[PDB]
UniProtKB/Swiss-Prot annotation, chain B:
UniProt name for this protein: Major capsid protein
Function: Self-assembles to form an icosahedral capsid with a T=7 symmetry.
Family as reported in the entry's similarity comment: Belongs to the P22 phage major capsid protein family.
Protein's organism: Salmonella phage P22 (Bacteriophage P22)
Domains as described in the record: The insertion domain (I domain) plays an important role in the folding of the capsid protein by acting as an intramolecular chaperone.
Result of altering W7 to N/V: Drastically decreases capsid stability
Site keyed Involved in capsid stabilization and maturation: positions: W7
Disulphide bond pairs: none
Superkingdom: Viruses
Parent-protein residues present: 55 to 108 of 430
Subcellular location, record wording: Virion
């Protein structure tokens, strides 16, 4: 399991979190490619139950 | 037919009578269901209920 460890230290008891949004500024986004998957899937209207329409 | 005994039988002549029975028809029987388009991606369940209605 230790092969997956991305952090050196587990969370303590009383520990200050830091919110990094102090302003409304508009984003600039960057990622390595294949970080966003777009899943698709057909709608099967050709079936004979739908026969009343093209 | 009725019958009556005796020789005389003046103006006792019977009339004919014949009766009736009326056959009838009833309201039709149905199995009625609907499937949205995204449910036809497998017909395997749609093919069963048609059988189940028969």
């Amino acid at each position: 399991q230790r092969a997956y460890a991305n952090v050196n230290t587990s969370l303590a008891d009383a520990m200050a979190v830091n919110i990094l949004n102090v302003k409304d500024a508009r984003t600039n986004v960057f990622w390595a490619d294949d970080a966003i998957r777009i899943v698709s899937q057909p709608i099967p209207a050709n079936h004979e139950l739908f026969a009343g329409m093209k | 037919s009725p019958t009556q005994e005796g020789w005389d039988l003046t103006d006792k002549a019977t009339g004919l009578l014949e009766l009736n029975v009326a056959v009838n028809m009833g309201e039709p029987d149905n199995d009625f269901f609907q499937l949205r388009a995204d449910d036809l991606r497998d017909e395997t369940a749609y093919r069963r209920r048609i059988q189940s209605a028969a």
